[PDB]
């Protein structure tokens, strides 16, 4: 009967928790108690990027660390030149409710998606001059929360239905589909070798997926509410995800466990974006209380705060050079930060 | 300083000019949000004032005021995450199936869910108690009574402020106003002047539905600006 299967599942879950509890000799705080803390990180709004008509939901950095795509409820994507505060392209979308955007590593394509169930791919470098839609990737039955490019011809998505998928752009045919979840998948972060990826889905669980395999190769169940952001440590062995409670936690794939909660008693608002610094030493987190905190991935103590915004931070990205951080908030402004010496 | 840099700056100026042009259309276009059951008749009203897919956007302008009305379709059962998008809209339009006695409770549960969200606290709600003529047939030709599914209906008489259209039985008026009373019962509690609820009675054929949204949205804007000046 189903009772036997339920008991077997409960026994297996007890086994998993026993294995996780066993190999947990120390906590990252114990090891890092001798590590010299970083000082107060002061970062100033070097250049504010103005022009979105309404709230910003997503941004992504070009791989050259100068260009920048942003998405707003308006129905527009703007390609900024960070260095010169210049507009390179401005793409008018078909559906106003865009919820994600990605910049192709080669600089040739940009993606977007949202409540309209489709992921759109745009050809930036066209012989005719304008930016055109290359493909509309239909097949999902729920809002599309994150889009990330693996190559010019492969893209990975995550939508409201409990589902992430890998697409072959020249065909539009969902090479693979990823099944296991119970709620809405919110975030996504490709490894820095497009071989694995992770996703957290509105059920206090984040799953690591094999792109060529499909199998859910790991799972993590530490959180207490919805998971709103996720990213890798550059090592590829760690990812930290921020939730709709006031906690950001750090997960390691090899240990298959939680490592360190970056939370404070003074914070009650949730986390809406998480991004690691180039060295894995600074962990930026966007909050609903109008400002971005900067944490220390090893010591778990705020080393800064980016108080320059008048509304909810929504997006947060660090360059591949490690030399800037950009923040988008519901005030339609996008600010670029770096320190001074 | 170089020529190519100057030309890039000029291109950025043209882009910014087009965006400033699009402000004036973005502002001065009042977004709404249509939420309603499967049998309600949402798209019916939508087509009325206009004349795997997700959002079903529609447009209509009345007396030179732009309205940009929405409709969320193939989305999962939970309304949790994507209702945050529809913050900062002028109203939420709610349509019920008035005739189908049994589903009123599901309709009221949805109403209470929309009314008390963490977002939508400042966003008003327009009702369209739809398919009223169907209720006229349902209760004119005597059949399963409202009291069958509703206990309190036995102790209910028509309130004085009613405005029965000519040719309307005094008990059918109780039929029409009992659902309105239930939904305004939900509306009056749990809310203090930040937002309100505007009941309406609409058959499937009536044409004056765009004007009602015009008047209601005018009211929302006026009450907002009056509270901002502490005259209300």
């Amino acid at each position, epitope marked *: 009967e189903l009772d036997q299967l339920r008991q077997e599942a409960e026994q297996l879950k007890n086994q998993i928790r026993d294995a996780r509890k066993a190999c947990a000799d120390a906590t990252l705080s114990q090891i890092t108690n001798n590590i010299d803390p970083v000082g107060r990180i002061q970062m100033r709004t070097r250049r504010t990027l103005r022009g979105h008509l309404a709230k910003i939901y997503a941004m992504h950095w070009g791989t050259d660390s100068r260009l920048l795509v942003s998405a707003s409820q308006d129905g527009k994507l703007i390609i900024w030149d960070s260095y010169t505060t210049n507009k390179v392209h401005a793409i008018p979308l078909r559906s106003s409710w865009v919820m994600t955007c990605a910049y192709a590593p080669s600089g040739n394509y940009v993606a977007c998606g949202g409540l309209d169930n489709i992921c759109s791919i745009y050809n930036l470098k066209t012989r005719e001059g304008n930016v055109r839609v290359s493909r509309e990737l239909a097949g999902h039955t729920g809002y599309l929360s994150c889009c990330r490019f693996l190559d010019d011809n492969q893209i990975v998505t995550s939508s409201g239905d409990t589902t992430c998928a890998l697409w072959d752009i020249e065909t539009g045919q969902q090479t693979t589909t990823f099944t296991g979840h119970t709620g809405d998948v919110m975030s996504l972060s490709l490894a820095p070798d497009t071989r694995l990826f992770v996703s957290g889905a509105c059920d206090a669980s984040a799953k690591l997926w094999d792109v060529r395999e499909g199998m859910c190769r790991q799972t993590f169940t530490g959180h207490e509410s919805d998971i709103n952001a996720i990213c890798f440590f550059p090592n590829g062995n760690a990812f930290a995800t921020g939730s709709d409670d006031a906690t950001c936690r750090l997960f390691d794939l090899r240990a298959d466990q939680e490592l360190m909660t970056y939370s404070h008693d003074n914070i009650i608002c949730g986390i809406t974006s998480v991004s690691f610094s180039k060295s894995g030493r600074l962990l930026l987190a966007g909050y609903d209380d109008f400002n971005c905190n900067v944490w220390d991935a090893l010591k778990a103590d705020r080393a800064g705060v980016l108080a320059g915004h008048d509304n909810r931070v929504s997006c947060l990205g660090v360059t591949d050079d490690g030399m800037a951080v950009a923040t988008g908030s519901w005030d339609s402004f996008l600010k670029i930060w770096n320190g001074s010496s | 300083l170089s*020529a190519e840099d100057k030309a890039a700056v000029e291109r950025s100026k043209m882009i910014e000019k087009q965006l400033q042009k699009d402000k004036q259309v973005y502002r001065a276009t009042h977004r709404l949000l249509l939420l309603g059951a499967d049998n309600s008749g949402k798209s019916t009203i939508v087509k009325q004032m206009r004349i795997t897919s997700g959002i079903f956007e529609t447009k209509f302008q009345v007396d030179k005021v732009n309205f940009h009305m929405f409709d969320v379709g193939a989305q999962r059962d939970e309304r949790r995450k994507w209702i945050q998008c529809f913050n900062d809209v002028t109203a939420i339009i709610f349509v019920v199936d008035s005739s189908d006695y049994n589903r009123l409770q599901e309709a009221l549960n949805d109403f209470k869910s929309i009314w008390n969200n963490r977002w939508l606290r400042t966003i008003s709600v327009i009702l369209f108690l739809n398919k009223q003529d169907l209720l006229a047939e349902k209760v004119l030709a005597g059949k399963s009574k409202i009291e069958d599914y509703f206990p309190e209906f036995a102790r209910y008489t028509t309130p004085e402020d009613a405005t029965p259209e000519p040719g309307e039985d005094p008990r059918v008026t109780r039929a029409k106003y009992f659902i309105r009373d239930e939904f305004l019962r939900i509306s009056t509690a749990s809310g203090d002047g930040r937002h309100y609820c505007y009941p309406h009675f609409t058959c499937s054929v009536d044409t004056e539905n765009a004007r009602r949204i015009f008047n209601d949205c005018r009211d929302i804007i006026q009450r907002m600006h009056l509270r901002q000046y502490e005259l209300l």
Partner: single-chain antibody, 230 residues
Framework: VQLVESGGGLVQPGGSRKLSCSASGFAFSSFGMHWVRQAPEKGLEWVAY????????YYADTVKGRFTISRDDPKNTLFLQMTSLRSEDTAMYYC??????????????WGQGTTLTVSDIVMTQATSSVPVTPGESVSISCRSSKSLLHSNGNTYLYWFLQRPGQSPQLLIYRMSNLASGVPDRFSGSGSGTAFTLTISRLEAEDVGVYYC?????????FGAGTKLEL
């Protein structure tokens, strides 16, 4: 993309004539245009410029108070109103498109040309002819008066190739890049004053005249050509 322009022929000295360039196949409003001219047996020479939005217009010293440039975005045509034509205006006028944003490739398409016949920075191409046999690696040079390396990293040297009876064609933009449809053989290097264009394995479709242009500041000035014969 396809640009054709017409409006040339014999004109008595002192007259006037309008040249029109009918663009079709690309978003004309997003591109700024140029006019470049080629004397009957000489090199290239920049003539005018009108930008996207029609807001910036430049000319050359020898046509400035005498020629005007205008565009019609809805009709996808570009004009050049020549007035009081002198005998030094016999040339093969071209209609060159150029878009300027971060990472663009200016001078990426050249029209076929129209024939007109009337009855500050110096770019030196000391060489003027090079014999070569197929499969040998060539190296064409070009020198500058000022230093073209602007403070922002760009070098603003352009290289072109016009084959025996064809319109020119972009090979290198900003001294180190490759146009869209150009073989990997071509490669350009330079220091900031002295420049080279190195073909790896020459083929019979590579014979022609190679031109170097600067784009640091107006006016734009060309070389004299470096013909490769076979």
């Amino acid at each position: 993309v396809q640009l054709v322009e017409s409006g040339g022929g014999l004109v008595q000295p002192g007259g006037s004539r309008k040249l029109s360039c009918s663009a079709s196949g690309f978003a004309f409003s997003s591109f700024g245009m140029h006019w470049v001219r080629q004397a009957p047996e000489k090199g290239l020479e920049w003539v005018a410029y009108i930008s996207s939005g029609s807001g910036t217009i430049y000319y050359a010293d020898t046509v400035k108070g005498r020629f005007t440039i205008s565009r019609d975005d809805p009709k996808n045509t570009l004009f050049l109103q020549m007035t009081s034509l002198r005998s030094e205006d016999t040339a093969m006028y071209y209609c060159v498109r150029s878009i300027y944003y971060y990472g663009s490739s200016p001078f990426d398409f050249w029209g076929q040309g129209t024939t007109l016949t009337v009855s500050d920075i110096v770019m030196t191409q000391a060489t003027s002819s090079v014999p070569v046999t197929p499969g040998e690696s060539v190296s064409i040079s070009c020198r500058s008066s000022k230093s073209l390396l602007h403070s922002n990293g760009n070098t603003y040297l352009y290289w072109f190739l016009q084959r025996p009876g064809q319109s020119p064609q972009l090979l290198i933009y900003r001294m180190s890049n490759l146009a869209s449809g150009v073989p990997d053989r071509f490669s350009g290097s330079g220091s900031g004053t002295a420049f080279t264009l190195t073909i790896s394995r020459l083929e019979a479709e590579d014979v022609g005249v190679y031109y170097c242009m600067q784009h640091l500041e107006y006016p734009l000035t060309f070389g004299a050509g470096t013909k490769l014969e076979l």
